[PDB]
Amino acid sequence: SNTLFDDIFQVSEVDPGRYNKVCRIEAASTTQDQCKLTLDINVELFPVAAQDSLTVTIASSLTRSWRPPQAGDRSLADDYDYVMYGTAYKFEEVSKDLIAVYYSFGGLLMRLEGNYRNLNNLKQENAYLLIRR
Amino acid sequence: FIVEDDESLGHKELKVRKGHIAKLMATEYQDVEEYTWSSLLNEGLVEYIDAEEEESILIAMQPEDLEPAELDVDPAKRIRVSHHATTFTHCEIHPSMILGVAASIIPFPDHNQSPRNTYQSAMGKQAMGVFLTNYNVRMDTMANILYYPQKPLGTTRAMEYLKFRELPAGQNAIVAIACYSGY
Amino acid sequence: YDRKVPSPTGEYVKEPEWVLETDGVNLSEVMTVPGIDPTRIYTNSFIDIMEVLGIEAGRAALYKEVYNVIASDGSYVNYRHMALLVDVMTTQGGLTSVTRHGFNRSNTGALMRCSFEETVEILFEAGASAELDDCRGVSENVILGQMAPIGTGAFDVMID
Amino acid sequence: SEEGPQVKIREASKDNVDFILSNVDLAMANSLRRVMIAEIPTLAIDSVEVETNTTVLADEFIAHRLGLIPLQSMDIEQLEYSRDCFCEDHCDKCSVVLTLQAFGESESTTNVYSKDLVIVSNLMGRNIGHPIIQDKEGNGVLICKLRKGQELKLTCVAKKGIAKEHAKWGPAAAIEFEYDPWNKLKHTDYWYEQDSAKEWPQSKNCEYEDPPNEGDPFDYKAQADTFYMNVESVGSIPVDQVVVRGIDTLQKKVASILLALTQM
Amino acid sequence: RGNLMGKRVDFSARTVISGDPNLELDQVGVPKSIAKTLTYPEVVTPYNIDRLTQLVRNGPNEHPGAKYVIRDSGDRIDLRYSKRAGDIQLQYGWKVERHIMDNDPVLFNRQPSLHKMSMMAHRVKVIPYSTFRLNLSVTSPYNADFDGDEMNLHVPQSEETRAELSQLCAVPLQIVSPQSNKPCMGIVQDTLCGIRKLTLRDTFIELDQVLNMLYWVPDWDGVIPTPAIIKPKPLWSGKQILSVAIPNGIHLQRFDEGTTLLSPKDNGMLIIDGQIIFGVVEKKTVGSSNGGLIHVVTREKGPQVCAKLFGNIQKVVNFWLLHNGFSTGIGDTIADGPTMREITETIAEAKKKVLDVTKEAQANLLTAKHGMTLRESFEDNVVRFLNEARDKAGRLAEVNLKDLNNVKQMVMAGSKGSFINIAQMSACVGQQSVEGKRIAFGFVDRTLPHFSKDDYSPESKGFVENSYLRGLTPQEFFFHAMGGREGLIDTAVKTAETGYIQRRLVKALEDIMVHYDNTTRNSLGNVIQFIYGEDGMDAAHIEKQSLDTIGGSDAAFEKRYRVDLLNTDHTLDPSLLESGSEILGDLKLQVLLDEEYKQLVKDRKFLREVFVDGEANWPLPVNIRRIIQNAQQTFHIDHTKPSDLTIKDIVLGVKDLQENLLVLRGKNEIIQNAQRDAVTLFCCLLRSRLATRRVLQEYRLTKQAFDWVLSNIEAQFLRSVVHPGEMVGVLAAQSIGEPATQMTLKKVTSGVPRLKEILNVAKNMKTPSLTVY
Amino acid sequence: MIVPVRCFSCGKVVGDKWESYLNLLQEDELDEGTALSRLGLKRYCCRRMILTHVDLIEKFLRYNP
Amino acid sequence: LKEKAIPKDQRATTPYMTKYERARILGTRALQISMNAPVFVDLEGETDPLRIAMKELAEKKIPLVIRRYLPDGSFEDWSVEELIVD
Amino acid sequence: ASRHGQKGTIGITYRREDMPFTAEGIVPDLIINPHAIPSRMTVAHLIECLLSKVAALSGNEGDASPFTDITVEGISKLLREHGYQSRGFEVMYNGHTGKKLMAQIFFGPTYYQRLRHMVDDKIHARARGPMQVLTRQPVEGRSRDGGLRFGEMERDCMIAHGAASFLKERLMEASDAFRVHICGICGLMTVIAKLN
Amino acid sequence: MNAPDRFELFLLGEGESKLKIDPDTKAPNAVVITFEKEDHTLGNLIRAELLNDRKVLFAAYKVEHPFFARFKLRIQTTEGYDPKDALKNACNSIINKLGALKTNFETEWNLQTL
Amino acid sequence: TLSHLRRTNTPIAKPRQLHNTHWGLVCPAETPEGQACGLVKNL
RNA sequence: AUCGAGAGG
Ligand SMILES: [Mg+2]
Ligand SMILES: [Zn+2]
Ligand SMILES: [Zn+2]
Ligand SMILES: [Zn+2]
Numbered sequence A: 001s002n003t004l005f006d007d008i009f010q011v012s013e014v015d016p017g018r019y020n021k022v023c024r025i026e027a028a029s030t031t032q033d034q035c036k037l038t039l040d041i042n043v044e045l046f047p048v049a050a051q052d053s054l055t056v057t058i059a060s061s062l063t064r065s066w067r068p069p070q071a072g073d074r075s076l077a078d079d080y081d082y083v084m085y086g087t088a089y090k091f092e093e094v095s096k097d098l099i100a101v102y103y104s105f106g107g108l109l110m111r112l113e114g115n116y117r118n119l120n121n122l123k124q125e126n127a128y129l130l131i132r133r
Numbered sequence B: 001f002i003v004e005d006d007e008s009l010g011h012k013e014l015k016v017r018k019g020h021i022a023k024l025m026a027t028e029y030q031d032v033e034e035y036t037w038s039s040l041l042n043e044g045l046v047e048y049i050d051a052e053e054e055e056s057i058l059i060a061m062q063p064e065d066l067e068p069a070e071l072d073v074d075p076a077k078r079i080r081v082s083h084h085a086t087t088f089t090h091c092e093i094h095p096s097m098i099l100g101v102a103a104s105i106i107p108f109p110d111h112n113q114s115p116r117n118t119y120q121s122a123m124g125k126q127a128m129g130v131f132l133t134n135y136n137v138r139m140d141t142m143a144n145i146l147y148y149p150q151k152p153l154g155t156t157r158a159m160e161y162l163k164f165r166e167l168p169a170g171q172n173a174i175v176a177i178a179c180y181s182g183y
Numbered sequence C: 001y002d003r004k005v006p007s008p009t010g011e012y013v014k015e016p017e018w019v020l021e022t023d024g025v026n027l028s029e030v031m032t033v034p035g036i037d038p039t040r041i042y043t044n045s046f047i048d049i050m051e052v053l054g055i056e057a058g059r060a061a062l063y064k065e066v067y068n069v070i071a072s073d074g075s076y077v078n079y080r081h082m083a084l085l086v087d088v089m090t091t092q093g094g095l096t097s098v099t100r101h102g103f104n105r106s107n108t109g110a111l112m113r114c115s116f117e118e119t120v121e122i123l124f125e126a127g128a129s130a131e132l133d134d135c136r137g138v139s140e141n142v143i144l145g146q147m148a149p150i151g152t153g154a155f156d157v158m159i160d
Numbered sequence D: 001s002e003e004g005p006q007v008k009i010r011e012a013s014k015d016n017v018d019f020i021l022s023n024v025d026l027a028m029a030n031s032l033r034r035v036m037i038a039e040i041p042t043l044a045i046d047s048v049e050v051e052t053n054t055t056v057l058a059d060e061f062i063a064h065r066l067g068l069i070p071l072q073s074m075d076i077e078q079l080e081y082s083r084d085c086f087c088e089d090h091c092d093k094c095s096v097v098l099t100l101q102a103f104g105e106s107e108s109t110t111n112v113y114s115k116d117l118v119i120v121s122n123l124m125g126r127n128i129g130h131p132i133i134q135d136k137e138g139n140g141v142l143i144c145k146l147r148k149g150q151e152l153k154l155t156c157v158a159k160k161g162i163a164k165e166h167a168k169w170g171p172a173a174a175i176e177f178e179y180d181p182w183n184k185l186k187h188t189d190y191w192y193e194q195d196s197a198k199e200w201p202q203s204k205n206c207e208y209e210d211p212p213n214e215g216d217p218f219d220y221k222a223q224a225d226t227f228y229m230n231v232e233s234v235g236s237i238p239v240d241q242v243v244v245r246g247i248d249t250l251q252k253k254v255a256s257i258l259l260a261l262t263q264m
Numbered sequence E: 001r002g003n004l005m006g007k008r009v010d011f012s013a014r015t016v017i018s019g020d021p022n023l024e025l026d027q028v029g030v031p032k033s034i035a036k037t038l039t040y041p042e043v044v045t046p047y048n049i050d051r052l053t054q055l056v057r058n059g060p061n062e063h064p065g066a067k068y069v070i071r072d073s074g075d076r077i078d079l080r081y082s083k084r085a086g087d088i089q090l091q092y093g094w095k096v097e098r099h100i101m102d103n104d105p106v107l108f109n110r111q112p113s114l115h116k117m118s119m120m121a122h123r124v125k126v127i128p129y130s131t132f133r134l135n136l137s138v139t140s141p142y143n144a145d146f147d148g149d150e151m152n153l154h155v156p157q158s159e160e161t162r163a164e165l166s167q168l169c170a171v172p173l174q175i176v177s178p179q180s181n182k183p184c185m186g187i188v189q190d191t192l193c194g195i196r197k198l199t200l201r202d203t204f205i206e207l208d209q210v211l212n213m214l215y216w217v218p219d220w221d222g223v224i225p226t227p228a229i230i231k232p233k234p235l236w237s238g239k240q241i242l243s244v245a246i247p248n249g250i251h252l253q254r255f256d257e258g259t260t261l262l263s264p265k266d267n268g269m270l271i272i273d274g275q276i277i278f279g280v281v282e283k284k285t286v287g288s289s290n291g292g293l294i295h296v297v298t299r300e301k302g303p304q305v306c307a308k309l310f311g312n313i314q315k316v317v318n319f320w321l322l323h324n325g326f327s328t329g330i331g332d333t334i335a336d337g338p339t340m341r342e343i344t345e346t347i348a349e350a351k352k353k354v355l356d357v358t359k360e361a362q363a364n365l366l367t368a369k370h371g372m373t374l375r376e377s378f379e380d381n382v383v384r385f386l387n388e389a390r391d392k393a394g395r396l397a398e399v400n401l402k403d404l405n406n407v408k409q410m411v412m413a414g415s416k417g418s419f420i421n422i423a424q425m426s427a428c429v430g431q432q433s434v435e436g437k438r439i440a441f442g443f444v445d446r447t448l449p450h451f452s453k454d455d456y457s458p459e460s461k462g463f464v465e466n467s468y469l470r471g472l473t474p475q476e477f478f479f480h481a482m483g484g485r486e487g488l489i490d491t492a493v494k495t496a497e498t499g500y501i502q503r504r505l506v507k508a509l510e511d512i513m514v515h516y517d518n519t520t521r522n523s524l525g526n527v528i529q530f531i532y533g534e535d536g537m538d539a540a541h542i543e544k545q546s547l548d549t550i551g552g553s554d555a556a557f558e559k560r561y562r563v564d565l566l567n568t569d570h571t572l573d574p575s576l577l578e579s580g581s582e583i584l585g586d587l588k589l590q591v592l593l594d595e596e597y598k599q600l601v602k603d604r605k606f607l608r609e610v611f612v613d614g615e616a617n618w619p620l621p622v623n624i625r626r627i628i629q630n631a632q633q634t635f636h637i638d639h640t641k642p643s644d645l646t647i648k649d650i651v652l653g654v655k656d657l658q659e660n661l662l663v664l665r666g667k668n669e670i671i672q673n674a675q676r677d678a679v680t681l682f683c684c685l686l687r688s689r690l691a692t693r694r695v696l697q698e699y700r701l702t703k704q705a706f707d708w709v710l711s712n713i714e715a716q717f718l719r720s721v722v723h724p725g726e727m728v729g730v731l732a733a734q735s736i737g738e739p740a741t742q743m744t745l746k747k748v749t750s751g752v753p754r755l756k757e758i759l760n761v762a763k764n765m766k767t768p769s770l771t772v773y
Numbered sequence F: 001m002i003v004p005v006r007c008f009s010c011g012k013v014v015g016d017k018w019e020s021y022l023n024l025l026q027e028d029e030l031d032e033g034t035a036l037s038r039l040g041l042k043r044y045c046c047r048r049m050i051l052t053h054v055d056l057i058e059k060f061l062r063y064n065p
Numbered sequence G: 001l002k003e004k005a006i007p008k009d010q011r012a013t014t015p016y017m018t019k020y021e022r023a024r025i026l027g028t029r030a031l032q033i034s035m036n037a038p039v040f041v042d043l044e045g046e047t048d049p050l051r052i053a054m055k056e057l058a059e060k061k062i063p064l065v066i067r068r069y070l071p072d073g074s075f076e077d078w079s080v081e082e083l084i085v086d
Numbered sequence H: 001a002s003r004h005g006q007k008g009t010i011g012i013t014y015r016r017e018d019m020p021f022t023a024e025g026i027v028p029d030l031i032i033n034p035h036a037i038p039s040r041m042t043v044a045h046l047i048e049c050l051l052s053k054v055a056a057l058s059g060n061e062g063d064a065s066p067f068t069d070i071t072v073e074g075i076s077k078l079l080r081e082h083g084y085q086s087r088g089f090e091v092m093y094n095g096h097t098g099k100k101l102m103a104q105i106f107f108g109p110t111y112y113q114r115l116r117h118m119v120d121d122k123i124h125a126r127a128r129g130p131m132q133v134l135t136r137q138p139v140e141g142r143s144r145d146g147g148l149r150f151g152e153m154e155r156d157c158m159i160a161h162g163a164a165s166f167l168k169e170r171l172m173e174a175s176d177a178f179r180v181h182i183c184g185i186c187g188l189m190t191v192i193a194k195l196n
Numbered sequence I: 001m002n003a004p005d006r007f008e009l010f011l012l013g014e015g016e017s018k019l020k021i022d023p024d025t026k027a028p029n030a031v032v033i034t035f036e037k038e039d040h041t042l043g044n045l046i047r048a049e050l051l052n053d054r055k056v057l058f059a060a061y062k063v064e065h066p067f068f069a070r071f072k073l074r075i076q077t078t079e080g081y082d083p084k085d086a087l088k089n090a091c092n093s094i095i096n097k098l099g100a101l102k103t104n105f106e107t108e109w110n111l112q113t114l
Numbered sequence J: 001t002l003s004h005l006r007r008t009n010t011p012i013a014k015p016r017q018l019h020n021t022h023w024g025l026v027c028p029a030e031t032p033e034g035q036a037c038g039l040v041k042n043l
Numbered sequence K: 001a002u003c004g005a006g007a008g009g
Helices: B018-029 B037-043 B051-055 B101-105 B114-126 C027-031 C046-053 C055-073 C079-091 C100-104 C111-116 C119-129 C138-144 D026-039 D059-068 D239-263 E032-037 E049-058 E159-168 E190-199 E207-216 E238-245 E293-300 E303-324 E337-362 E374-400 E406-413 E419-426 E474-509 E554-561 E587-610 E624-635 E647-660 E669-678 E680-689 E692-697 E703-720 E728-742 E751-760 F017-027 F032-039 F044-051 F056-062 G019-034 G049-059 H036-040 H043-058 H072-082 H152-161 H164-173 I040-052 I083-111
Strands: A003-015 A022-029 A036-042 A053-059 A082-085 A087-095 A098-105 A108-113 A128-132 B003-007 B011-014 B171-177 C004-006 C012-014 C020-022 C156-159 D006-011 D016-022 D042-053 D071-073 D095-103 D110-112 D128-131 D144-146 D151-161 D172-179 D227-233 E012-019 E027-031 E039-043 E066-070 E076-078 E095-099 E105-109 E119-127 E132-134 E150-154 E252-254 E269-272 E275-279 E527-529 E543-546 E617-620 E770-772 G064-069 G075-079 H030-032 H105-112 H124-126 I019-023 I031-036 I056-058 I070-077
Touching: A087 E275, B018 B037, B101 B114, B114 E474, B171 F044, C027 C046, C027 E770, C046 C055, C055 C079, C055 E728, C055 E751, C079 E474, C079 E527, C079 E728, C100 C111, C100 E474, C111 C119, C111 C138, C111 E474, C156 G019, D006 I083, D016 D239, D016 I083, D026 D172, D026 D227, D026 D239, D026 I040, D026 I083, D042 D059, D042 D071, D059 D151, D095 D110, D095 D128, D095 D144, D144 D151, D144 F056, D227 D239, D239 I019, D239 I040, D239 I083, E012 E032, E012 H124, E027 E032, E027 E105, E032 E119, E032 H124, E039 E066, E049 E066, E049 E095, E105 E159, E119 E159, E119 H152, E132 E150, E159 G019, E159 G049, E159 H164, E190 E238, E190 E303, E190 E406, E207 E238, E207 E303, E207 I040, E207 I056, E238 E275, E238 E303, E293 E303, E293 E624, E337 E374, E374 E419, E406 E419, E474 E728, E474 E751, E474 H152, E554 E587, E554 E692, E587 E647, E587 E680, E617 E680, E624 E680, E624 E703, E647 E680, E647 E692, E647 E703, E669 E680, E728 H152, F017 F032, F017 F044, F032 F044, F044 H043, G019 G049, G019 G064, H043 H072, H043 H105, H152 H164, I031 I083, I040 I070, I040 I083, I056 I083, I070 I083
Parallel strands: B171 H030, E012 E132, E027 E119
Antiparallel strands: A003 A022, A003 A053, A022 A036, A036 A108, A053 A128, A082 A128, A087 A098, A098 A108, B003 B011, B171 H105, C004 C012, C020 E770, C156 G064, D006 D016, D016 D227, D042 D151, D071 D128, D095 D151, D110 D144, D172 D227, E012 E150, E027 E132, E039 E095, E066 E076, E066 E095, E105 E119, E105 E150, E252 E269, E269 E275, E543 E617, G064 G075, I019 I031, I031 I070, I056 I070
């Protein structure tokens, strides 16, 4: 019931792809050699600017039918501007001493690789991706 | 039409001429001194050719091919190979005349593929229409007549000779091309 | 013909090979010629293959030809159907046609043969021949109106 | 003025009214256009019995035209649907009966107009069944034209009806609907060879709304409450009455659902 | 020939057909008058007496009704006129000829009748209007399109007859075709285009449309899916609602082109538990072909779930497309001016090359080509020049065509359109061919009376530079008319010839059925095949699979499949097996592994012998990959844990499974040998798919998971065995017949003529040839 | 046969226009579309019903019976 | 042919019921049920004879023996209960 | 059917409020599928819709004569001067929702012809009907209330399916079922049988 | 011939209930209401107003076939809240908004002079 | 009516196929379909 | 009945 991982990620390049609404993002962990990520996001909901540093966070929680926020008393889980929900398509190891996690969020896909995370990360269908400006 | 040598001594040209068309148009308007197609044949401006005679002749589709051709072109216009022929014995009166009555009905069949044209000819024979004005007096075994026959919006020139505009067999329906409800 | 063959490593590698194409077929003399592989040579016509090499080789070539026409379509028919047709022509020693000359002329059954073609001729020759129809045939049963020995009709159900 | 929807009419006319609908959900406006097209009651001829027909036009043809002919329906709410009424065939309050006879006395073809049709049934002091003529001459809509030696002689029974039942009862011909003219909502994606702005003309309804600025990001939350609509009347019912009857008819449908629940 | 083989039949109806999205695939929309006229005799039963009395009271005029009542004496009681029509009270043993009611079995038939798929049982739903209503997906096996198409409906009159129709002839059962090993029915036309457009990651569905689509799926979980995007706004990807439509517990993976896990192209699909991870839905995924979602659903659960899936996908996709819309248009055919200039330049360069080749022919400075006349070589070169010109023009058009182009959208969906259609519409329709030749000079040395004599230029010979949009010239139009005329004549001739051919095949093969000994035999008992299809297995449920042992480097095959317990490197890493540290040494286990490796090597040599091409994929009974995927998702193994499974038990269990599969039951040494021959390739596949090293490397299979896989493989193979009694020959003849109708037209007899020579076994051959090697 | 009462697509009355329309195009030598604009029918669904229709009834009238 | 009895132990016909065998068994049981036959299985909300036949097949209550036949003519008789339905 | 070879049945009839509507409110009398056209490859139908729209707005009849060169771009230019889109795609709104359609839909005037064939004449249904005496089989045709004929191909299809009893019922009970008396000694219908 | 009469679309026949309420299965507070002889026109507005209410979790319109004018609406509401009450409140809100619009439009027309 | 009045019938090398000599005399596209296609032509 | 013609898929 706590966040699996948090980082500051600086993106060098965003590729629009064939789609206009959805662009892919190629970022790396800032000051860390170990973590690099490529993630599909929608620019209309939140516009990724080139050379932005954006806070990335993955959280397990915070079946059940989705409920619209019943009132303002129900507190938003995140200050973060962007949140997605999705399921990992694969947990792999890039090379020995290098793990990679491939999470799919609504068909949008993100891959991020780094050793320390695999002890945090679990084969959980639940994941919340939290992007802060 | 017949192409012979040096009309006005200038250049191999069509035997017909604009004043002849003007007199024929005057006769059509008066409907004076008659100017008839049979009269054109007696003038020798036009000749009747059999296929065996056709092998020996050289024909130009367009009367504009014969006049001397000493640049920018709209892309939509279909590419025309230069005729590149010195002598034409005759010129076809209009290309559309090779087509049949049902093909004369078909709109833009040059832009269309031919098998669809054949299917539409058969369907047009099958399509309902007011065959004659005297149908009400007539007692036919099976008669189908449209309530409000509508003349076609896009008509061939040949149609004015076909009398299809005068006695139409279809309705100009507002058509939308869409995927709606899956029917 | 860009044939593919095992490499020394064991991976399949494609080596180009020279092949000759002949407008005519004289199989017996052609195969007994130097400079060719006797095993690899193939004929467009299956009947010459069957006479030169045996019935089974002819059956193989027959299935190959039917495969060629289905591939010219691009359609795929499962191996068993074409195979069954080729076997029906092949089980009889002579290579048997699908036309009346052949399968209808074959002795098995009497009313299936007349249902295909030459109905009255088969019936007349049968009366002169006094052949007894088993009535096992599906077409014969359809004529009889009795339920045919189809899969559903084949087994007999009785009380315990 | 009133909380809820607010309407500012752009243009007024007997034939048409152009208005601006504000603070409205789209579903309600669509439902209102549909109730206006279909549900509003009108009087049109439902039965035709002809004694003599010398016309070249067939009797069924003329009857269909007569059903298509406009008849006044301002007092149609005072008139009752025949199926709601206890008469065996028709009573004077539920049906309006028109008689029409037209002979070709003139050698020239004699036209037959809606003004020639006359009413035998009692008016009962209500504006019902009057033939509608917007023609400047006052000549009615022409059913047939009869050559000399031709007489036509018929009776017509006009009952209350709705356009869902048959298109002839429709009070309005075309309803013009516009929303998101600037495409800020981006409900539609423009098909363009080179440029969408060059390929699609700006609607007249774009200029009323303030033009979108390319600087601001698109808002996902935004929903359009402003619509530009136009109602055109045949004349059997006046435009203001047509749209008011659409509103009222939808209200009666909703109330019928509510009272059905109360009965449950 | 006519009356006995084919009778005019009572209780037969015929109507024009129209397509209804909402009606279920198995159902048929039967007009109310048709159901009222058609009567099913139903013996009065204690359960049905009340219903039947109500039907009789309702009468022939109104359905549910009954036209006739049959007494115990059998005297007819006519409902339309009877003095006791209201008097009657039902008595046991009586028969009521009920009006045809909803959810009753009938037979729906198309007149070409090339296939068993053209005649299938259907559930009845009585429709108000007049035209037969059917699902779109059932059009393809019926080969019908809603242009006045007319189809026949036949009603069973007996309960045994009804049970035959429902148990064997039902639409969901015949979804999978025995021939071609693919399902017959797939999502067609707007549903395919719409599913593609919905699956795009750009496409996102708002909560209102999401709720309405959730409701639109007839069986809904009741749980609103968690939004793909939450915090900005609760956006939902169309893939998520589509996944809610996908049945849970089914996993599909397809790798095409660059199917990276990141998949920037979005090509291919990954579905786990009926939930799509990545992809854009394409035709093959939802298509009739094997490896499609239809085949997987039909195999895993059954046919009924598959038909329901057809329905649900149709409803959701049609609603979404209804909101989005689609329109072909003039402008989707139009092309950019720059690309059009490149098009005309390409055509001009082709013409210049043709004229230079013609000049070289005139100079006689043209190389002699062996085996062909020099004129023949000239004709072939010019024809190829024009063909390449048209194809390159079409390529320029397609690159010019935007992603928004609706013909491109249909082609990407695969629903409709072809590259050639675009090329003819925008650049060039091509060079017309008559009798396999360029247009001939009917007049001496002139193809047309306008053309000068002795002209061999493509315009004289009939090459149409212009597109369909720009319009054909009169000469081009006449030549195109010649081509179309040949096409129509050939079409009619092909239909006639293929009808005769199909009848001959059917009559030749009809009597042969699989007898109870599994020997394919005719009625007389002459054995056509000792084992049917040489494997003794039903043609359905067989899908192509790749055999990993064939092909590849010998060293790589050794690395993947060989484990030696003695060498430190060869022995499995201890993370893979808990026994692994104990496994080091363990010479008695190493000898068993060496034995299995020797078996694998012999199998590899055998498979290399069978196919010189060594093509990986061949039709096989049981899809191992899907079973392995189902095991991995069912037991959710993290694959960190060492396998519970002994290194001995994998080999012994695989051997036990080989002993378990018997095509033929009898304990005859000849029958045993024939069984081993039948399952030789299947055993090779099973050993290649699950090697001890492979079982521990590709996944960390728990011993229970390996046992489950073994049981499932055995069960599936037993499902795949051919049912005895099946009439194999008629199915074979129809299998040839329908594609033979479909075929339409280096110089060899091909298609229908070649087939006719093959079938006639004629001595003469139009194109004999010897392939000298 | 005769002038339609209303355009099929939307339903605006076109029976009133026909006589006036012919009179306008004869009186001013007007373009047909300009006469349609004077008729007040601005939608092509209304325009087609007037322009495409031909009075077969006049020829039927010419018959004596 | 005549006394072509096959030992019940020495039977090589497939243990699984052929789909034709199931179809004809279900049809015959439903046909008899429609003609007021006794029903040996307790029924819940079923009136259709074919549903009762399918339930009986799942119960294996039907006392019918399918006689498997061979091209030679030797008959192998299998009870419905003996045959696996799957 | 259309003037360009496209033929089809009426799938359904829709009320005007249900059908999609443009901002002008014009509802198409006819709705067709985009998918039929690419395989049929009939550009001329689309060109006819464009030209007829131009003609309806202009009031001047359009020429669709063969071998006469008219630019689609020029016709689109005239449509542009009218203000309608050059391609002729029109922004539409879904009838049920009132929502704007995501894709603009081609809206044109198209000449369409009513084919002779009509469903209600075509429909025939016979459960029991008159029979020709010699055949003892159903008569032929709707006019005779005559049954459809199962084909030999249909019988073969049923053999492929495997339902012997269904084919027996269609083959005998549905048509020319007959009971005969025959003798055991000679396999001929020599026996004459009196049942009373 | 076989085609149904037009009249059947707007009048209920054979005592058909205008609304039939049946509790939804597998959803705790949901209920399916079959509106009979009713069209899309009413249903879209009813669903939209149900979506506006905070307590309603689910509302949607479905018609099983275009031939028959039956409209099916399933309602899921917050616990302690009647779905029927939600539907009635949404309907009453619809009526109040339509009345207010009618009054405003009438005032504007009285201002209009044509 | 007009098309029936202008009818050609060829009773029965390659008669069905459209010929170059047909140009200017016979309609390229008017012919029966399926059976007897091109044997009958329209002038 | 038959023959013929035509048309539809
Ligand atoms: Mg068809
Ligand atoms: Zn009354
Ligand atoms: Zn209009
Ligand atoms: Zn005897």
